Amino acid sequence: NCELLATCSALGYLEGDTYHKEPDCLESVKDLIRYLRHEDETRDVRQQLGAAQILQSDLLPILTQHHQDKPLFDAVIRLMVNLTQPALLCFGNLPKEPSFRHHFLQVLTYLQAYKEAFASEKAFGVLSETLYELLQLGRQEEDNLLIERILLLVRNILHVPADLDQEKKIDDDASAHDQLLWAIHLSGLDDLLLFLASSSAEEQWSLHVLEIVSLMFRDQNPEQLAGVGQGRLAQERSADFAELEVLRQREMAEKKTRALQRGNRHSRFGGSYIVQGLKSIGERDLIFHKGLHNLRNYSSDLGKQPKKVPKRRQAARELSIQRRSALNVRLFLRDFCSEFLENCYNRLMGSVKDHLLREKAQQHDETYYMWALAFFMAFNRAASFRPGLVSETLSVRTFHFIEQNLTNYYEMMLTDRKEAASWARRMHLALKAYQELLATVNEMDISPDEAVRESSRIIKNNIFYVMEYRELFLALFRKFDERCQPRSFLRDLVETTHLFLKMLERFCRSRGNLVVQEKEFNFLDYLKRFACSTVVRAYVLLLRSYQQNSAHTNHCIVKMLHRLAHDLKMEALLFQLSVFCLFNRLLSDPAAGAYKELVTFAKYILGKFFALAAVNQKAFVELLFWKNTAVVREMTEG
């Protein structure tokens, strides 16, 4: 430790607010590079430099005050570009070994400190001025390299994640990412991103600008971002008072129910009762030791602890939570997003698609391209501008491209067991983008223009005639798994299914019959494929969280369930004890008034069950087990 801490001091010293470099500072930073060139795989030199806080202590003063020496400026920039490179790229993965895990965490800690240190607007200002000078040349390879490393420096600074677990800030407060983003605006560096994105000859930089822009907007979804306006202050104030009111009210109500359930006399007042005629697990009647009031809602299991699960038996879970940034940041982001869509989207997408098609040996990350089209199409649609603003993406090639990518991800998720989690994440991203394409063609039907309506019919015609889009949903439902994907994937999949069936039904109405890739089609025959009992199990799992599901989610799932049960007459497939337990809890909750469709559907299907049970007593056995299609149909025959 002491060796580096002693030698690194050579760069200079600070006098009040004036920084004085040493006369061999350049040779000194060259020695720091020589240290890094012979660093250990644990990244020990980087941890030592971080402990010595060289970047915060000397490099920021050198860049702010001594940048007139362009060779020294170049040396400092490249040094900190190597130092700031994200930990996942340095180690190659999050390490399995505890020693390397500790080193990774420590390196990432120093990177977090560097990100906080970089928040000074003066650095971005100098960087933007330098970059503004470089682009005026219409240059040497070293000039291009300086542009490259400037872009990569801000990329690396943005890339290292914020520790929301450390910050624990309330909504509308600024995180480290938020403050740094605001500093980008305050420096004017954003204007250069829009120049680079809009200028045609800068296509080589546009691929980097895509990563920069997509890194900035991560915390804000485009729909709520499009929602913002100057009156939001009073809106949030009044709404928060209302939210606090209902929260307090709910706790009061629940308390009183518990208070009435408990007896009034103290916990040692005693007593004992025999439930005459109710036999035990043993040969004789049950003896009950608890208070008299408890028998009003008795179930024998109330005394039991839950079953202890094995470690490897646990399902997947979310590592993320919804947020909103400070109103200043929200307004700035909305302006930037509007200006990017206005000036840059189609040109940048054409450039990025060109690079992804041409430059396959370079292994560029396609997920950013899909993220950007998924984000900006949603923003454009939320603002309901003319479809011309997103013209480039409105073509069949996008559907085929994302289908082959999504099916590749699906096949890899199945085959490449060692990376199935990441393949599932990639597949989920692709599904999200595809849902936006469907929403876009649906929206232009309700436009006033016949030309775009005809274009919509052309796209939808190809999508429904070809096999892949109508087969894909069944392929995903067939291989959904609790370890493989969290429930968010299932929500997206079933909602996309409802939208696909809606547009399919509307398209089938155009002619006496639809012919498809070759066979005469039948909508009811296609829906019969979803009568697989595994699909119903997934639907029931999604239904357990109906109070936490969105209103749109609940509408979509209940609509599809009623259609499948009623019109296909497959009703007996829903006669299940797990479902009946959920129905019992549903009808017991006093909040049932909010869920009229669900309770009426539940009472309807239970009516069918009790009507059958009155005739046939075997239903009480069938209720324990899942049905094959033949059994579902045979139960009505008896």
């Binding site: 204007d191 250069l192 120049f195 200028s199 052309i458 190809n462 002619r511 005469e520």
Partner: peptide
């Protein structure tokens, strides 16, 4: 078969000085 299939098949600048 043939007629529906046939008819359904047949359907198918600014400088950097300006910004900054």
């Amino acid at each position: 078969k043939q007629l529906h299939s046939e008819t359904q098949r047949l359907i198918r600048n600014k400088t950097i000085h300006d910004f900054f």
